[PDB]
Design a protein around this ligand. Structure first.
Ligand SMILES: *SCC1=CC(C)(C)N(O)C1(C)C
Ligand SMILES: [Cl-]
Ligand SMILES: [Cl-]
Ligand SMILES: [Cl-]
Length: 164
């Protein structure tokens, strides 16, 4: 298991534009296109992202390319964020992956706002952090995925992902 395999499990793989859990146009492995309710706007973003006239369909290689860029962006974002960097730096590789997962799903600013959870993580108060993380819109809207990510932070193991 690794951050790529983890996010692949959590995000799935779809080669045609689809709506994500929040109802936003997405493609590939959780590649958010736009928050706009316009399918045309989403197709424009897609074409720009891929560099060709796609008309809402991409190949597996293209999906994997956007995925690689998105994972890189999440990591890059964590490192440039004053709140996220110290937490990330303090964690082991498995827990680092859990933090990248959250950033991939909700964005740098979103995760940076989890002030209390971040402090507990920094303090290595694993059970306390896990309890705090669940007190969120995140957990309530995507509980199965949040449970996996939280288990990863609580245990520092890939237990939540090994049978998936
Ligand atoms: S958040 C910690 C916690 C409190 C209580 C309601 C007793 N629980 O079942 C858990 C372990 C979730
Ligand atoms: Cl998804
Ligand atoms: Cl992009
Ligand atoms: Cl879920």
């Amino acid at each position: 298991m690794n951050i790529f395999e983890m996010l692949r499990i959590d995000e799935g793989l779809r080669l045609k534009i689809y709506k994500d859990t929040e109802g936003y146009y997405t493609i590939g492995i959780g590649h958010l296109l736009t928050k706009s309710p316009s399918l045309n706007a989403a197709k424009s973003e897609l074409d720009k992202a891929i560099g060709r006239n796609t008309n809402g369909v991409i190949t597996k290689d293209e999906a994997e390319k956007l995925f690689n860029q998105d994972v890189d962006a999440a990591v890059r974002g964590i490192l440039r964020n004053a709140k996220l960097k110290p937490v990330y730096d303090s964690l082991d590789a498995v827990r680092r992956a859990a933090l990248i997962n959250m950033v991939f799903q909700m964005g740098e600013t979103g995760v940076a706002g989890f002030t209390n959870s971040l402090r507990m993580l920094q303090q290595k108060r694993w059970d306390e952090a896990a309890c705090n993380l669940a007190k969120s819109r995140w957990y309530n809207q995507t509980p199965n995925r949040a449970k996996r990510v939280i288990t990863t932070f609580r245990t520092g193991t890939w237990d939540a992902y090994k049978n998936l």
